Write a protein that binds this DNA or RNA. Structure first.
Lengths: 262, 206, 141, 143, 64
RNA sequence: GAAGACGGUCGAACUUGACUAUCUAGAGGAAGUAAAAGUCGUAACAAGGUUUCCGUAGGUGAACCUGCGGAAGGAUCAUUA
RNA sequence: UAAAGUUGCUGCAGUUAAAAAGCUCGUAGUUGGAUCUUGGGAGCGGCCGUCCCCUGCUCGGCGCCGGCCCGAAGCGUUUACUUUGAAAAAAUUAGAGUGUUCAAAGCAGGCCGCCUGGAUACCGCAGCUAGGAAUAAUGGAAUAGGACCGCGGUUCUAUUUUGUUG
RNA sequence: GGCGGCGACGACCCAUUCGAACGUCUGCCCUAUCAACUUUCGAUGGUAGUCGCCGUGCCUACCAUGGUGACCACGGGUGACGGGGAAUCAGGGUUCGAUUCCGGAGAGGGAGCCUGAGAAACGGCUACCACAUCCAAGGAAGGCAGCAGGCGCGCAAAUU
RNA sequence: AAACUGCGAAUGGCUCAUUAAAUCAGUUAUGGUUCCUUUGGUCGCUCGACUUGGAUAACUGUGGUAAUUCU
């Protein structure tokens, strides 16, 4: 190509959207935004595919242009806006509020929350730099550039920010023992306490994470978030609590629920 | 056009390539600026990404520095003396980066004399007759003259600079890329740099 | 194999590579000379124009006269003696007729009693010679 | 020794015309647990491509190979032998790549046979993407 | 580029010897007994069993 | 601030000659293969009527013949103090 | 493409069926003798089974009258190998669920507003990671510029140091 | 007369997303009737510039004599776009992959460039070459390897 | 409506001719670069008019060429 791509083929789309392979040739190419192409859930896919308010994409136009969908605090009239991790989708006329947190299976769950909870989100810091006149700047995973943060906030921390203002409240240091939502790789959606960050100078730093049931796994650092101090999370978790019960456990727990419920 | 292509060239091994693609744009070359001494003609380019680049084609003024004691002044360039690239880019008076150029000294001489209050260059017998800077060699209070004398303890200049300042022509080295930035800035040579380049001027000349 | 070294991958591959050329079925397919000298140019079938009807004397043992058809191929301009199948089907081939011509069955080798005839006539004037023989299609003239 | 070339030879960082009444040397730690040699810190030479006293930054890959040729100015040829698995024959074949590698004159005691450690940096020249980081002499070679 | 499936596989395999008397007359014994219409209806069942029977072989190699 | 020109640069193309990858025409020559019954012989298979064969020479209508050395795949596993 | 073990790594042949160079030397290639740790300490089941241990020196917590037990860094023969981990587009293939009426398919669906799915496996080689050290290579001290020790000499160097300042 | 709300558009720079570009490591079919090749019309490297978005013999000037190869370079061929994949299939394999996804390339062949963030763009322009259209014969216009459709080519492929 | 302006037209689609360490793939680098757009910063930080100037198109009119989305 001799310039940037504007289309995205349906078969080329990221797997976690769970678009089929018979409705169209194309998937919605996410609008350029805070989150990456492969990590974002576009608004259209959150409206017509998950919540199923709309049927078509012209329906999602007729909902979003009425200025109802308020993604993390601000109204969005773009059907392919990249809503991503921790972002709070406020549909005001239904009085519903959703936080995009990963189900323990790779896909984003529909996780309803209290409006009292919806007022804040939690942001992983990507880097810190010192701006034009000794002014410490602070770039997050959703690119929310914050000037004059608390000086004890380091590179891989998280920051509980208030959406109505956009100011930090409290920050979780990246320390051993803290809860961790894993936001990349095979362990996507998994929750557990951070056990051992193993430093590999020049290469990628792996980070071991012990689960709540004790089923310890590992991840590359870059794919790791922190959601709580020790064992207590700062969000509401989606059901399953980021454990990833095995295919055998899933099977007999489907059999058990299928017979017991009736 | 004039291309900047790795693929027109023989491989490490000595075997020659075939082009799988035709000349791309982003492999621009552009013709050499070949900037000269004279009244300012600086053309602008539009370059990769809608950015600007300042083709110097004639350039005389230059913001040269005098590192030894921190001062840097806009000064007229008079000659190209030496180039470590080609011997022709001295014959053809072409300013490039790491050119050795004769520049004026009078901004530096005015500074030195308006900071240390010592007549620098200036042969004995030859006074300053018009009475301009004879006023700016005297006429302080008590403790301001004291400050100048305490500072004057550290006003010994090198023998080479003292000889160059006499002719009104210092030797300076272009640190800018006039074809790119459109400025002929740099630094005045001192010490073993100036010893080296005076030997190379002396080597080629005689 | 006659070198069971653990570090002998290239000798074993490079030997096999060299000794595959001593196979007929390989040497044939992996040179131009078999695909060039092929009158059909590597094609399955080929339309050509009948320039005479030819009796070919059957082999040593059995002794009939095999009614074949001398063909100028269109694509190449090359000369082919192509056999005509079942009883009395040379009566369906007027001279200067465009005939579709296939192989005989043995991948360009001479078949049965017929010396150096590798081809059969399939259709004549774009009408199938089985359909003319069974009388299903009539010859358009 | 130095100022052989037509242009003057100096480190671009250190300024050597502070007013008086030895040239101080710029050097850096390369990282990745590699000790900068004493020769780089002590030395008089100037080499812009040296990963201790030059404008080059080592990142990405760290390789190793036996030195083959020390012929041309300030660079050598290493020879990296490896075993390529052909799967049909469940066997390996001895292959080699011989890359051109820049050899900083902080490493002086280098002979053709010494196992040299190299680090990936920006392209120095048409064929050279590796500077030398340390030198281990061939097994035994002391006399 | 189109929104069509393409995914489709055969549900039978034609047997290697086309004229085993023992097979021809055991597959017609099946067709008569169970009122099927051609040997494709038999090779369809035989093929499903062979895929089941292939998957079983694959799992019996694995450790308990 | 338009035309236009000098110079540089990228460079299609064109002329001239050589090198050359494929295809094609070719007087004539010289082979090979294929036919049901052509001519001269009978070289080989029986000690094939001079044992056959190898290498290398020369010769001759043709198979071939002869010299020299070699082989048994020989027509002798042996031949007697 | 299989059948072709008629291209042969698995796995072919080479006295006479096609085939071992006239013979030998010979460099890259390929292959290469043996040898370098073992006994028991702790515990269970009914003499035999399954586990934990048989490297060492800067920063703090289960404690103690400068250090003892231990936690976290950093140096630690070098590789192949094996096991684990990270990471590795979907689509295809295997494969979980699901009566497209069956099926190929599909990614849906189920229940008198609620519930549920859209799993998982494989992804040679090369690269990254962490256990094992058998097998194979490589190494170290042999004119001693050899260890482990404490000592006495010599060139350049953090200041804790003279109430605050020469 | 002075103070302000909700937006729209604009804007230097930093960051972010979307990429792009050039680099690292390792991996490709046949061929030796291709064994030496590359190099003062750059071959490998040094030094200093020019150019370029930047790293680089990318290019100039002066240097040094390198660089690659029996672990097959170099040259030639390929009915060779590469890959994810396809067929076959005890276990090994063999063959295919123009073909809907990824990446590359080209718009009759070469070449040059305008605009723009992004093009050496061809449903943009400028020449040349080949072909071809309209012409009051002065001139003008062209690019279906987009969708249909036509001719031709063929064994071989659909509705203007 | 037209017209100026802005944005797009560099995506999509087609084909596979060329191309054999090239393309491509896995794997890293960009501490060597560029980046419309979105997103978030930034946008009285410089100590030195209650809104300015000349056009040009659409429109009207006069055309020319056999002919063009010519002008």
């Amino acid at each position: 190509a001799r310039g940037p791509k504007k289309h995205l083929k349906r078969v080329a789309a990221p797997k976690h959207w769970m678009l089929d392979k018979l409705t169209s040739v194309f998937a919605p190419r996410p609008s350029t935004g805070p989150h990456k192409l492969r990590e974002c859930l576009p608004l259209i896919i959150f409206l017509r595919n998950k919540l199923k308010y709309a049927l078509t994409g012209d329906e999602v136009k007729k909902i979003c242009m009425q200025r109802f969908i308020k993604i993390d605090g601000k109204v969005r009239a773009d059907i392919t806006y990249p809503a991503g991790f921790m972002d709070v989708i406020s549909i005001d006329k239904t009085g519903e509020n959703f936080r995009l947190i990963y189900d323990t299976k790779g896909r984003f769950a529909v996780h309803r929350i209290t409006p009292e909870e919806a007022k804040y989100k939690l942001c992983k810091v990507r880097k810190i730099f010192v701006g034009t006149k000794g002014i410490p700047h602070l770039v997050t995973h959703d690119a929310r550039t914050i000037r004059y943060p608390d000086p004890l906030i380091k590179m891989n921390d998280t920051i509980q920010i208030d959406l109505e203002t956009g100011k930090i409240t409290d920050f979780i240091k990246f320390d051993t023992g803290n809860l961790c939502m894993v936001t990349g790789g095979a362990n996507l959606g998994r929750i557990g306490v951070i056990t051992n960050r193993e430093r590999h100078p020049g290469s990628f730093d792996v980070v071991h994470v012990k689960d709540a049931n004790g089923n310890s796994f590992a991840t590359r650092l870059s794919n790791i978030f922190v959601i709580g101090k020790g064992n207590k999370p700062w969000i509401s978790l989606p059901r399953g609590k980021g454990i990833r019960l095995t295919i055998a456990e899933e099977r007999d727990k489907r059999l058990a629920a299928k017979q017991s419920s009736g | 056009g004039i291309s900047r292509d790795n693929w027109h060239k023989r491989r490490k091994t000595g075997g020659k390539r075939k082009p799988y693609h035709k000349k791309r744009k982003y492999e621009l070359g552009r013709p050499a600026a070949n900037t000269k001494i004279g009244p300012r003609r600086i053309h602008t380019v539009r370059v990769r990404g809608g950015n600007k680049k300042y083709r110097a084609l004639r350039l005389d003024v230059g913001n040269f520095s005098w590192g030894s004691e921190c001062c840097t002044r806009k000064t007229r360039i008079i000659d190209v003396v030496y180039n470590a690239s080609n011997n022709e880019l001295v014959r053809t008076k072409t300013l490039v980066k790491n050119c050795i150029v004769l520049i004026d000294s009078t901004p530096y001489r005015q500074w030195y004399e308006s900071h240390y209050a010592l007549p620098l260059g200036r042969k004995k017998g030859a006074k300053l007759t018009p009475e301009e800077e004879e006023i700016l060699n005297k006429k302080r209070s008590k403790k301001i003259q004291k400050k100048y004398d305490e500072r004057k303890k550290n006003a010994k200049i090198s023998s080479l600079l003292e000889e160059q300042f006499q002719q009104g022509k210092l030797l300076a080295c272009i640190a800018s890329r006039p074809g790119q930035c459109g400025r002929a800035d740099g630094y005045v040579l001192e010490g073993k740099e100036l010893e080296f380049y005076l030997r190379k001027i002396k080597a080629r000349k005689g | 194999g006659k070198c069971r070294g653990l570090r002998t991958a290239r000798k074993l591959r490079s030997h096999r590579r060299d000794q595959k050329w001593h196979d007929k079925q390989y040497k044939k397919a992996h040179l131009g000379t078999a695909l060039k000298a092929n009158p059909f140019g590597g094609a399955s079938h080929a339309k050509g124009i009948v320039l005479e009807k030819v009796g070919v004397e059957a082999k040593q043992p059995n002794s009939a006269i095999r009614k074949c058809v001398r063909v100028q191929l269109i694509k190449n301009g090359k000369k082919i003696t192509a056999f005509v199948p079942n009883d009395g089907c040379l009566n369906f081939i007027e001279e200067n007729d465009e005939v579709l011509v296939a192989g005989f069955g043995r991948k360009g080798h001479a078949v049965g009693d017929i010396p150096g005839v590798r081809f059969k006539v399939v259709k004549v004037a774009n009408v199938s010679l089985l359909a003319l023989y069974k009388g299903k299609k009539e010859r358009p003239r | 020794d130095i100022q052989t070339e037509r242009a003057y030879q100096k480190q671009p960082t250190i300024f050597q015309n502070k007013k008086r009444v030895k040239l101080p040397r710029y050097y850096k730690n390369i990282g990745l647990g590699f000790k900068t040699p004493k020769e780089a810190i002590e030395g008089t030479y100037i080499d812009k491509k040296c990963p201790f006293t030059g404008n080059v930054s080592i990142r990405g890959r760290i390789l190793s190979g036996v030195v083959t040729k020390m012929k041309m100015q300030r660079t050598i040829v290493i020879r990296r032998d490896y075993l390529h698995y052909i799967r049909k024959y469940n066997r390996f074949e001895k292959r080699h790549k011989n890359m051109s590698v820049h050899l900083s004159p902080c490493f002086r005691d280098v002979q053709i046979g010494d196992i040299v450690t190299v680090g990936e940096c920006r392209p120095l020249s048409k064929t050279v993407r590796f500077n030398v980081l340390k030198v281990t002499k061939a097994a035994g070679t002391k006399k | 580029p189109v929104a069509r499936s393409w995914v489709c596989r055969k549900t039978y395999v034609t047997p290697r010897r086309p004229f085993e008397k023992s097979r021809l007359d055991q597959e017609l014994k099946l067709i008569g007994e169970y009122g099927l219409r051609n040997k494709r209806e038999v090779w369809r069942v035989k093929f499903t069993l062979a895929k089941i029977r292939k998957a079983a072989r694959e799992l019996l190699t694995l450790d308990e």
